[PDB]
Structure 1
């Protein structure tokens, strides 16, 4: 099996949800430092390139 457009269909919000479930009962700082990456990825911008 292959998956069609895995990275164009997966969402950073779902990765944030996964990280939130994984880091239950953990110190707050650890949860924050892990959560920053999905948050920044759900607000990401893409350079268009050369033109």
Structure 2
């Protein structure tokens, strides 16, 4: 049994993987729902951090 933890979870995941996950999960829904579910990882791949 491995008691584990992942380093840099928010710093190494990618919204371009989440876009592909919502494209492969919603592989039978109508086209409007696939556009709706693909908008959010698109906005998360163009995020601009404000520096406090």
Structure 1, unaligned runs of 5 or more: none
Aligned counterpart for 1:36 among listed residues 26, 35, 39: 39
- The Cα RMSD (Å) is 0.5
Per the normalisation by structure 2, the TM-score is 0.90
Structure 2, unaligned runs of 5 or more: none
Distance 1:5 1:43 in 2: 20
Q: Higher helix fraction: Structure 1 or Structure 2?
A: 1
Q: 1:4: how far off?
A: 0.2
